[PDB]
Design a protein around this ligand. Structure first.
Ligand SMILES: *[C@@H]1O[C@H](CO)[C@@H](O)[C@H](O)[C@H]1NC(C)=O
Ligand SMILES: *[C@@H]1O[C@H](CO)[C@@H](O)[C@H](O)[C@H]1NC(C)=O
Ligand SMILES: *[C@@H]1O[C@H](CO)[C@@H](O)[C@H](O)[C@H]1NC(C)=O
Ligand SMILES: *[C@@H]1O[C@H](CO)[C@@H](O)[C@H](O)[C@H]1NC(C)=O
Ligand SMILES: *[C@@H]1O[C@H](CO)[C@@H](O)[C@H](O)[C@H]1NC(C)=O
Ligand SMILES: *[C@@H]1O[C@H](CO)[C@@H](O)[C@H](O)[C@H]1NC(C)=O
Ligand SMILES: [Mg+2]
Lengths: 487, 506
């Protein structure tokens, strides 16, 4: 109740919807009472927003004589609360200091709802983790950009990997959802057009159980001789459940798991089942650590950081102590916060931190190019920039081309989507180790590191090529890659 | 004469009078045979017209589903030829094909006066891009005249507020006699006198005499050396250079402060090689940024491709002093032949008032758009109320027009069809090893005068004082009206038995 907002003043104010708290319980959905505080998706991304705007105001090349402000609201990873705060943006325009554009939110569905709201008022929205290829349609989501690649780009990466190693007959398993269905149908179309055959579409949920995973493993073994590669558009723990199935049913290394981004180099899926895990090839989303972010965030102190209102709550929650003498001091904590406490103690940077920073820079560069166009000779905001036109800002943001925080030359296509830049990992008995890269179609790889020799490359084919004497290829009737050699 | 016209088709056609050629020789004024081609005032402004109409037709927000055409005629900077071409405008208007809705230009203020006197007879709105003379401010006499440039009176107001800001009560005045000197000087006199500033004397000097008259006038200016030191200069370009040559000759090196006009704003040919006496002067420059997209268009042009501009072959041959072999408009008497490597980027200088030409074209376009939005509310193109366009209605729309210019300016016209003044103040300072340069010191935006006080002067003591009489002691004031000047008094002791009635008499 009476939600707080971390807002920074400036000549231009950019809205931000971060997931500071967890989504409310099933009970309080009609009440909108968020859960515990979130470290990575919350406080870290809020501080990223704040310090990135500070660093952008510091830069004299980008937006000179203009101050960038923000208004950071808690989305709580739930469509309803995000809609509440987006409505607060829409009314807070009212025309103090209207919101030019919104950053986020996290979830793709929550992003869809926030976009359906914002496009009604011509407010450009840039996402940092919304990947579902439903948002690629710009007739339905006119003002939606994103610095992350769609799920279709990842399915394209898997298609070209299966292509490169001449795997014509492959099985398919996906975690059913708005990600499984999407990635799997994109993979099906792309593979079928490239000349690859699928056994059929297998869907397994993560919370099925330790018997449905075994039934699905047997349904996958029902194609044991011909197919050996299982294209896996799967969540994180779905791969661990299938590795537990490989342990149970004793299929140790009888199949090749082409892992998705859910299982990229995340140890918690393999550890203690590393036996069956060896051999798998996984797609990881290339995300380097933003050094200067860590340098800023790890120095923070609740004694000093007052602009982030959730930082006192976060300090008490992370260290399970009580910030004695502070305004947001909470009881029910037995221990008291020691002055030695530091954020460096077991610090893990946010998964997609680089993408949050890149989206903030995307908004900043769009505003800067709009100022350079509308106000040619002016340094700050001339009368064409007062007020900023949402339509014109969108026009500029669609054209935006800049070099990201990690060296990426990030730019948006006609559909407001960003190019895919993944790195391929192989789980080898030495750990996930890098084996190649995928840059928007350009697939380079270390062929003689995933396999020792050219003979070791597992073959996945339904029917062997017909004899030079006995050539006549005849379609059996069930699959296109299964023929009968007749005279 | 069979003059050629650069015309572009459209649903609405806008006339334009640009100065493609020089004005005819004194002999051929009754013959109307124009001179050499002009790069900046000519070809550049013609291409500006054409490409600006292209870019406006590209915009779906401004005039959607309507095509803007034009008819670009050579005014030759001479009243007679401009009247000829304006007559062709008004007659193919009367005949209907494709009447001329409005005219852009011309350049000269006198030629603008004549063209306006012609056009207003047929209710054709005219927008000027360089006609500044404040004679055109009267709308009872020039009912259909707009202009995106400020009047000369706005510039005199800028000088008045500059003299005001630095407490310069007693200043001398010099102007180049003409339709600009007289105007600016009388406006300055009225404004200064109302603000509380006195004039030492108003000297008028012509640009063509000199080397004796400049020295006599410099001596007449020195006849007030101690009291007055600031000389408000409503002067042409080379008049300031003549006065700097006088300062060189008579050895008055930095004995006076020259408050320069737009004739000498950052115009180097006035200072160069006399930069010694030029240092210190404060000049008003008309803020004109470079139109990037214009250059991007113009510098790519090629006579092999550009056929819509008929003068482009002549211009290509003249600028590069070569011969366009194999072309229809190929001219002899050129010894060299045109190389295929030749580019317009070679020593390119954008037109002085290019932004204003583009802003005038946009003014006409936005006026037409607002007229279409009013007459035809739901319609996209031209309904029957827009067929035909009423000159009176178009004028009504253009007077109310308010839009954001090419450079971010909020261009709008007042009740007198004049635009707000947006000037920038320059100071000629010695910047290091023999590097003399005009440097920005502040801005004047229709009354709002911002400035960098501690950059034109190092300290508050360095600010030159220009005052006739020092303030009288508070006890014994008795300021005496001599009878000749309004603010030049003599401080006298008030009679011991008399009382201090006011600050003027006892
Ligand atoms: C504008 O920016 C310059 C640096 O580029 C700075 O020196 C100046 O103080 C700024 N002025 C305003 C009014 O922001
Ligand atoms: C992106 O911008 C750079 C300049 O920083 C330019 O060289 C490059 O061609 C641009 N690329 C695209 C695709 O616009
Ligand atoms: C206006 O022009 C567009 C093309 O830009 C065309 O599709 C549309 O049909 C036109 N509208 C009318 C009413 O003619
Ligand atoms: C002008 O005089 C007033 C006092 O009448 C003073 O306050 C002001 O600073 C002066 N301005 C300048 C530029 O000297
Ligand atoms: C054309 O230009 C090139 C480069 O400027 C020059 O080397 C060449 O000699 C020129 N050709 C003629 C015929 O002058
Ligand atoms: C802009 O134009 C409108 C015409 O409707 C006028 O009322 C308004 O005063 C103009 N803006 C300014 C700042 O004068
Ligand atoms: Mg900045």
């Amino acid at each position: 109740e009476r939600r707080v907002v971390a807002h920074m003043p400036g000549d231009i104010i950019i809205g931000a919807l971060f997931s500071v708290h967890h989504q409310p319980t099933v009970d309080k959905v009609h009440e909108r009472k968020c859960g515990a505080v979130r470290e990575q998706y919350g406080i870290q991304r809020v501080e990223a927003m704040l310090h990135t705007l500070e660093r952008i105001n510091s830069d004299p090349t980008l937006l000179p004589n203009i101050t960038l402000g923000c208004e950071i609201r808690d989305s709580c990873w739930h469509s309803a609360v995000a809609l509440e705060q987006s409505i607060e943006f829409i009314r807070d325009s009212l025309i103090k200091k209207p919101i030019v554009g919104v950053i986020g939110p996290g979830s793709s569905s929550v992003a869809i709802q926030v976009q359906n709201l914002l496009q009604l008022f011509n407010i450009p929205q840039i996402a940092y983790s919304a990947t579902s290829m439903d948002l690629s349609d710009k007739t339905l989501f006119k003002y939606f950009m994103r610095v992350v690649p769609s799920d279709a780009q990842q399915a394209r990466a898997m298609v070209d990997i299966v292509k490169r190693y001449n795997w014509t007959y492959v099985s398919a398993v996906h975690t059913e959802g708005n990600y499984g269905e999407s990635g799997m149908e994109a993979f099906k179309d792309m593979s079928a057009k490239e000349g690859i055959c699928i056994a059929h579409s297998y869907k397994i949920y993560s919370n099925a159980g330790e018997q449905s995973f075994d039934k699905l493993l047997k349904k996958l073994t029902s194609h044991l001789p011909k197919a050996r590669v299982v294209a896996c558009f799967c969540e994180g723990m779905t791969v661990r459940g299938l590795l537990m199935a490989m342990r149970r049913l004793g299929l140790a290394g009888e199949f090749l798991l082409l892992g998705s981004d859910g299982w990229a180099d995340r140890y918690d899926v393999t550890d203690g089942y590393q036996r069956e895990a060896v051999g798998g090839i996984t797609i990881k989303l290339q995300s380097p650590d933003v050094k200067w972010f860590d340098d800023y965030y790890l120095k923070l102190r609740p004694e000093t950081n007052h602009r982030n209102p959730w930082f006192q709550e976060f300090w008490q929650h992370r260290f399970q102590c009580r910030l004695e003498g502070f305004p947001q001091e909470n009881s029910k904590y037995n221990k008291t916060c020691n002055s030695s406490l530091t954020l460096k103690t077991h610090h893990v940077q946010d998964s997609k931190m680089g993408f949050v920073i890149n989206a903030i820079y995307s908004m900043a560069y769009g505003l800067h190019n709009m100022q350079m166009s509308l106000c040619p000779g002016y340094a700050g905001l001339c009368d064409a920039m007062k007020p900023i036109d949402g339509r014109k800002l969108l026009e500029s943001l669609m054209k935006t081309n800049f070099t990201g925080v990690s060296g990426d030359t990030i730019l948006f296509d006609e559909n407001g989507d960003s190019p895919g830049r993944y790195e391929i990992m192989n789980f080898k008995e030495m750990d996930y180790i890098n084996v190649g890269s995928w840059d928007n179609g350009e697939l380079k790889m270390d062929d003689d590191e995933v396999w020792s020799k050219k003979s070791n490359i597992i073959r996945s084919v339904c029917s062997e090529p017909c004899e030079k004497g006995q050539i006549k290829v005849i379609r059996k009737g069930e699959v296109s890659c299964c023929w009968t050699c007749t005279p």
